[PDB]
């Protein structure tokens, strides 16, 4: 049935189908991968945000973080970078509060930027797949219709029943294209919405910590 | 009858029809459930906003709020959490007056976020249904149309008497899809508008309460 039509298809149509299937597989893999990482980052950030305001002295938290002596993730990295910059900048160079505050804030900004960059990989591929996929299906449909009409003129008998299969092949190509296209188009926005909220939370934490550091200068 | 057409259909068409009916039922249930909650929340918020500015001392309001503590919601919950954090920080530790205000603001923000999260349940599913259903209907129709084309490719001298049931079965899927997709779109925007209009009252109350707490600190 349909398998016979696929077997009787031309080379370009089969190549297009294979490309679309590969794109679908890659998109699904990325979508399945990213969500767990995002949720884990959210809960890890919330936990350390709760731990900060319990009332324990900041020196003890910094000592524990240094004792960990390993790569951190989330709001822990920002606090470590800021405190490490502050420790050296307070005694050295200018003792004016503005200079030390700005020096700590610069390190916090750099840490935030690098963490955000590390959290936002492989996302634009979904958008570019969603944008590009339908055109390949339309190309396959047009090629199939063109070849079907070209083959018809080579015989004396003119019947639409002879032209019927090419339309089926073109419709199959279009359906596969749309099926590959839609989910990435949805997932792109569904995933960007979360990164926006994470950025907002990090900005609020940075503002609070900068105020707390400044008020003791 | 329609039941006969359902019986004579293959597995795929039956599954699609059942899925569409389930989506319709779920959408109706979600709309009916959410409308009452969104209506009651506004009335409760307006009542408490009117009550607060009567000029009664805040200590009396906090004392009265503990009677029904497990059933508080909205601005009452926000005020209760803020006052509890303020009194705990003030009477349990000796710090600068700004730290207590900062902690109260953070507690109020967390409470407001939790309240909004509880209020905004089950909404995006309507949008997903509205954006998905027509494509499912189109796929269900294209499957039958392609099979009809494949069947007609081999036969000769068609009299339009053999392919009529295929068209009759294909049209019902699209009809059901449109019927399912109609109400979700109109419910989504109204519910989102109500939530957005509700957020501003909480924001304004938080700002006013922080300003009020600052003076007596």
């Amino acid at each position: 049935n349909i398998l016979d039509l696929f077997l009787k298809a031309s080379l370009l149509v089969k190549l297009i189908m294979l490309i679309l299937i590969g794109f679908s597989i890659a998109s699904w893999a990325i979508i399945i991968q990213r969500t767990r990482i995002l949720n884990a980052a959210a809960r890890e950030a919330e936990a350390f945000e709760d731990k900060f305001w319990s009332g324990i002295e900041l020196s003890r938290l910094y000592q524990e973080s240094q004792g960990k002596r390993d790569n951190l993730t989330g709001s822990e990295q920002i606090f470590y970078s800021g405190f490490k910059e502050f420790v050296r900048l307070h005694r050295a160079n200018s003792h004016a509060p503005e200079a030390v505050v700005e020096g700590a804030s610069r390190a916090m900004r750099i840490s935030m930027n690098r963490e955000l960059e590390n959290l936002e990989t492989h996302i634009p591929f979904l958008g570019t797949v969603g944008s590009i996929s339908p055109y390949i299906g339309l190309f396959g449909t047009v090629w199939g219709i063109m070849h079907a009409f070209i083959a018809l003129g080579a015989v004396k008998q003119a019947t639409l029943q002879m032209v019927a299969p090419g339309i089926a092949e073109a419709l199959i190509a279009t359906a596969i294209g749309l099926f590959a296209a839609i989910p990435a188009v949805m997932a792109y926005n569904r995933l960007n919405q979360r990164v926006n909220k994470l950025e907002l939370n990090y900005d609020n934490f940075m503002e609070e910590f900068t105020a707390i550091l400044h008020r003791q200068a | 009858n329609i039941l006969d057409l359902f019986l004579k259909a293959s597995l795929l068409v039956k599954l699609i029809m059942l899925i569409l009916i389930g989506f319709s039922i779920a959408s109706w249930a979600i709309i009916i459930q959410r409308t009452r909650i969104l209506n009651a929340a506004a009335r409760e918020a307006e009542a408490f906003e009117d009550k607060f500015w009567s000029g009664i001392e805040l200590s009396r309001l906090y004392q009265e709020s503990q009677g029904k503590r497990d059933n508080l919601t909205g601005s009452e919950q926000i005020f209760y959490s803020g006052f509890k954090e303020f009194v705990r920080l003030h009477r349990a530790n000796s710090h600068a007056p700004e730290a207590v205000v900062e902690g109260a603001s953070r507690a109020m923000r967390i409470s407001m976020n939790r309240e909004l999260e509880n209020l905004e349940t089950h909404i995006p599913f309507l949008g997903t249904v509205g954006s998905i259903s027509p494509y499912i209907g189109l796929f269900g129709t294209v499957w039958g149309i392609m099979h009809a084309f494949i069947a007609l490719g081999a036969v000769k001298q068609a009299t339009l008497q053999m392919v009529a049931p295929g068209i009759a079965e294909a049209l019902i899927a699209t009809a059901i899809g449109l019927f399912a997709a109609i109400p979700a779109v109109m419910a989504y925007n109204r519910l989102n508008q109500r939530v957005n209009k509700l957020e501003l009252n909480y924001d304004n109350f938080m700002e006013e309460f922080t300003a009020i707490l600052h003076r007596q600190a």
Binding site: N1, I2, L3, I21, S24, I25, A26, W28, A29, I30, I32, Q33 | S10, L11, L12
Partner: peptide, 29 residues
């Protein structure tokens, strides 16, 4: 990181193979 990506790729591949096999079978009926 890479191992999780490979596992997700394998899961997606097997799911797609199962779906295509199911679709092909329905054509004979």
């Amino acid at each position: 990181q890479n191992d999780k990506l490979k596992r997700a790729i394998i899961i997606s591949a097997v799911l797609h193979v199962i779906l295509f096999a199911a679709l092909i079978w329905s054509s004979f009926d």
